[PDB]
Amino acid sequence: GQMRLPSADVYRFAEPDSEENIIFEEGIPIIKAGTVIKLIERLTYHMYADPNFVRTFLTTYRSFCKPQELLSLIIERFEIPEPEPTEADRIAIENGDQPLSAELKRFRKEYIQPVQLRVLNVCRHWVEHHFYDFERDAYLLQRMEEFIGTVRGKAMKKWVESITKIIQRKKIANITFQSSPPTVEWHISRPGHIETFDLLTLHPIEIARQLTLLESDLYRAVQPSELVGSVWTKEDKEINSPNLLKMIRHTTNLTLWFEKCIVETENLEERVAVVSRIIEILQVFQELNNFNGVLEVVSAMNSSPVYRLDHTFEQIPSRQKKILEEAHELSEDHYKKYLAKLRSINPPCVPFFGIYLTNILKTEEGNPEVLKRHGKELINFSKRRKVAEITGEIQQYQNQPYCLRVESDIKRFFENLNPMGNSMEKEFTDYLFNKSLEIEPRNPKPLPRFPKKYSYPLKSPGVRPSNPR
Amino acid sequence: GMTEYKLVVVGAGGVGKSALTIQLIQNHFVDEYDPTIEDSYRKQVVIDGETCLLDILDTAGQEEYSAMRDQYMRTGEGFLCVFAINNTKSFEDIHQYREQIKRVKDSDDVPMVLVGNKCDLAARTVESRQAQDLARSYGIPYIETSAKTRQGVEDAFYTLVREIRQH
Amino acid sequence: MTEYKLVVVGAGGVGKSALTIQLIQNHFVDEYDPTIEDSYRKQVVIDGETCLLDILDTAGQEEASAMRDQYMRTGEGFLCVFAINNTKSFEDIHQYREQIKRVKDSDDVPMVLVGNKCDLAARTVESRQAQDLARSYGIPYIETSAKTRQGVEDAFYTLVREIRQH
Ligand SMILES: Cc1ccc2c(C[C@H](N)C(=O)NC3CCN(Cc4c[nH]c5ccc(Cl)cc45)CC3)c[nH]c2c1
Ligand SMILES: Nc1nc2c(ncn2[C@@H]2O[C@H](COP(=O)(O)OP(=O)(O)NP(=O)(O)O)[C@@H](O)[C@H]2O)c(=O)[nH]1
Ligand SMILES: [Mg+2]
Numbered sequence: 152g153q154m155r156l157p158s159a160d161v162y163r164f165a166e167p168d169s170e171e172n173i174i175f176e177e178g179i180p181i182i183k184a185g186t187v188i189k190l191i192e193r194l195t196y197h198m199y200a201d202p203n204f205v206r207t208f209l210t211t212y213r214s215f216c217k218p219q220e221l222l223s224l225i226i227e228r229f230e231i232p233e234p235e236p237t238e239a240d241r242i243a244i245e246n247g248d249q250p251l252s253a254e255l256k257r258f259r260k261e262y263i264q265p266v267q268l269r270v271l272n273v274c275r276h277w278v279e280h281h282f283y284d285f286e287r288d289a290y291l292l293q294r295m296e297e298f299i300g301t302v303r304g305k306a307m308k309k310w311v312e313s314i315t316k317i318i319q320r321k322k323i324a325n326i327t328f329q330s331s332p333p334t335v336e337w338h339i340s341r342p343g344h345i346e347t348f349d350l351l352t353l354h355p356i357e358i359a360r361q362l363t364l365l366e367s368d369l370y371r372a373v374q375p376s377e378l379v380g381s382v383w384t385k386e387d388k389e390i391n392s393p394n395l396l397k398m399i400r401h402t403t404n405l406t407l408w409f410e411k412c413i414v415e416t417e418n419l420e421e422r423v424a425v426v427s428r429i430i431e432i433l434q435v436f437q438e439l440n441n442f443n444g445v446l447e448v449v450s451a452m453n454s455s456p457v458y459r460l461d462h463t464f465e466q467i468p469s470r471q472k473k474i475l476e477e478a479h480e481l482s483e484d485h486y487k488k489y490l491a492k493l494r495s496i497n498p499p500c501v502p503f504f505g506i507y508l509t510n511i512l513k514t515e516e517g518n519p520e521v522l523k524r525h526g527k528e529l530i531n532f533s534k535r536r537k538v539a540e541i542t543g544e545i546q547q548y549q550n551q552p553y554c555l556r557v558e559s560d561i562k563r564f565f566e567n568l569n570p571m572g573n574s575m576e577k578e579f580t581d582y583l584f585n586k587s588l589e590i591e592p593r594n595p596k597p598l599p600r601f602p603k604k605y606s607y608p609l610k611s612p613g614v615r616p617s618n619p620r
Numbered sequence: 621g622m623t624e625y626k627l628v629v630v631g632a633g634g635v636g637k638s639a640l641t642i643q644l645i646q647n648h649f650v651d652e653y654d655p656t657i658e659d660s661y662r663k664q665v666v667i668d669g670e671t672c673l674l675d676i677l678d679t680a681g682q683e684e685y686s687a688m689r690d691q692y693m694r695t696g697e698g699f700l701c702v703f704a705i706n707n708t709k710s711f712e713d714i715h716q717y718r719e720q721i722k723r724v725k726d727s728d729d730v731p732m733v734l735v736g737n738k739c740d741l742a743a744r745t746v747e748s749r750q751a752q753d754l755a756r757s758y759g760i761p762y763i764e765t766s767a768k769t770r771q772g773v774e775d776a777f778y779t780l781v782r783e784i785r786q787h
Numbered sequence: 788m789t790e791y792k793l794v795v796v797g798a799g800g801v802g803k804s805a806l807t808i809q810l811i812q813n814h815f816v817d818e819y820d821p822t823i824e825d826s827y828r829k830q831v832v833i834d835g836e837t838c839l840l841d842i843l844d845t846a847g848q849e850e851a852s853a854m855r856d857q858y859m860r861t862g863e864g865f866l867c868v869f870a871i872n873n874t875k876s877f878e879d880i881h882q883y884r885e886q887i888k889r890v891k892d893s894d895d896v897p898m899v900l901v902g903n904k905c906d907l908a909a910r911t912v913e914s915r916q917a918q919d920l921a922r923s924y925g926i927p928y929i930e931t932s933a934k935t936r937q938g939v940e941d942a943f944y945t946l947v948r949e950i951r952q953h
């Protein structure tokens with residue numbers, strides 16, 4: 152038979168499942184909705200582990216339970232009463248013999264120890280992967296240290312001592328590869344000559360590599376705390392989503408820099424060389440699976456100032472037209488081909504973050520926080536699972552590092568790029584459009600000629616890498 | 621066969637803009653949504669007795685990717701310019717969205733509707749007369765919508781399709 | 788994209804977590820933090836086919852020994868890990884092999900025998916002895932180092948191939 156449980160009057164987590172407290176989706180069960188007590192019971196269930204559920208819950212729970220209350224509830228879950236001696240035990244004791252305690256031993260082995268260990272696993276994941284709760288609430292951290300540091304008894308001892316050390320390490324807080332990275336490539340600008348660095352003087356291969364390292368680092372720094380609750384759209388977004396916003400602002404700045412490089416090159420022949428060079432950078436982005444970089448270029452080519460430069464794009468070689476067209480087609484039909492390509496490539500990659508943001512926001516806005524059933528309000532957990540499926544996908548692509556060497560000077564050049572200067576956005580984008588009208592006027596105005604601005608060779612070194620001994 | 625209309629929703633972030641398309645496309649009578657599902661943004665409708673397909677682009681949440689707006693806007697034949705009736709700044713942003721649409725489409729006469737969205741019970745700060753006057757100065761319709769009751773949602777999209785049809 | 792459920796099992800301290808984190812993050816963990824249960828995902832192209840690995844990293848400490856049926860039911864394939872400088876961990880392999888066979892009620896479960904910590908000079912389990920055991924199970928034997936990455940991809944991706952052909 153099943154183990155008997157403590158009375159639900161002394162231990163709240165022994166109440167029977169009913170549709171008034173938990174609803175399952177239609178081989179472990181999947182929870183659609185439940186009370187917080189039932190969610191925590193299943194989070195730490197005696198019959199099975201659910202590591203996905205632990206991540207989902209710890210990522211999303213603040214939309215229905217405060218951190219202080221979560222800690223109180225899992226401490227309550229941990230403190231399980233042991234059953235009293237059975238009739239057979241009583242009779243042994245009355246005869247001066249040692250009882251067999253079969254039911255007590257089974258309940259310890261099959262209920263208490265698994266539930267308690269799974270509570271500790273929640274604590275461990277909470278500290279390791281969601282430590283911001285404790286950074287933001289020092290008293291919460293004190294309570295967790297006190298709880299862990301006072302767990303008695305030898306069955307939990309290895310994990311209690313470990314979690315204590317992990318907490319202390321987190322309070323005061325290296326990559327190996329299957330090969331060597333390729334050699335850094337140089338073109339007109341030579342190492343150390345940062346004053347000459349520019350779109351056409353750096354090697355296009357190395358531009359794409361160093362931007363990919365920068366954009367990968369920016370992608371990898373975004374934590375789920377910046378996403379859940381749609382906080383990057385709200386009034387406190389600079390406080391709650393700083394790494395996400397830094398990543399987006401880099402993308403925007405590079406797109407505008409590409410546009411500015413194009414329209415400030417007034418000579419037609421030189422501007423063709425600029426656009427051709429940016430398409431070569433796009434080709435290397437594609438080879439590196441840097442989809443953020445691919446779309447940075449595509450967005451620049453489709454901007455109002457650049458898109459209308461028919462005389463420029465007429466001279467672009469047919470093969471480069473095809474590269475740009477294929478990249479543009481990634482975004483068509485609501486990113487259909489992009490989504491398929493991302494799911495087929497071999498990482499490392501840099502995803503485009505914008506699709507994730509729209510899907511998290513619409514999932515939050517389009518589903519209710521609670522489901523009403525039999526007069527009760529149940530937490531709508533399916534909605535939180537959908538959000539955590541998106542944050543889980545994001546995290547999966549954050550794991551794999553690029554095997555490329557940093558060039559500190561080129562990295563600094565792109566970190567300090569500031570195409571808008573001190574200008575506001577409208578003033579700057581109006582400037583770019585007015586430059587576009589100057590260099591290729593609207594028909595029927597004649598096309599003017601403009602003097603060259605570059606004193607160095609415009610011929611590209613190409614984007615196939617070289618390898619000396 | 622039937623005509624497909626490519627509609628684009630534009631407007632300030634953080635003030636409930638996404639509720640418009642969600643409430644339209646939704647199972648009208650079950651409050652649920654998975655935006656990741658292939659064609660959670662396509663809907664076959666009958667407008668003035670003529671069946672058509674709406675393809676709605678709503679990039680809500682991507683507002684900080686400001687240099688992508690041109691690319692997204694160029695996909696559209698008609699535009700819903702959305703502000704929140706309790707956020708004056710989102711209303712003041714409308715002029716620049718409209719100017720940007722005209723530039724991207726290279727036309728002074730782009731089908732569009734002005735939508736005032738009631739996203740919560742916070743106090744209204746943009747009166748309907750202010751928004752009607754702005755819409756009239758542009759020569760476009762004005763529709764008010766509720767983000768909670770679905771009121772006005774069909775009217776906003778169907779009015780835009782009629783603007784496209786009568787362009 | 789085909790999804791594969793991999794489970795890493797073996798005695799405490801043999802390097803199951805270090806092997807998994809080296810595969811996932813290209814990083815070697817120096818600390819010994821005993822696992823309760825952890826799970827990881829990895830998209831990777833193997834033999835020209837993209838798939839999604841779900842990797843369950845399990846508890847080796849004996850205090851968790853009564854909680855294994857639940858993860859053995861879900862796993863498709865198992866990395867059975869011992870450390871080549873720990874003879875007791877090698878003797879513990881057969882207990883994991885037998886439990887997996889019982890729970891899945893099958894003599895034909897995809898498995899790979901993994902001898903970890905092969906970067907260390909002071910070996911106590913000879914390759915021949917582990918290879919003999921692997922042959923008796925009908926499975927390959929791969930020596931690994933979570934520290935240097937030697938053998939790590941080979942071990943996990945060999946297990947994927949055995950699930951794929953199962
Ligand atoms: C890559 C390409 C493809 C086709 C062409 C053509 C022929 C084509 N039937 C055409 O008349 N395209 C008109 C609009 C597009 N514009 C080029 C362009 C500017 N920014 C972009 C962003 C993304 C894409 Cl995909 C294209 C562009 C040229 C004029 C001439 N040049 C081409 C270059
Ligand atoms: N030299 C060397 N040390 C290793 C290797 N793999 C793991 N270790 C070390 O061995 C210790 C235990 O590693 P760990 O991965 O935690 O083992 P585990 O099998 O996951 N333990 P548990 O079953 O308790 O979760 C750590 O100190 C780790 O750095 C290896 O290949 N070489
Ligand atoms: Mg471990």
Ligand code: NA
Pocket residue numbers: 706707708709745
């Ligand atoms: Na206001």
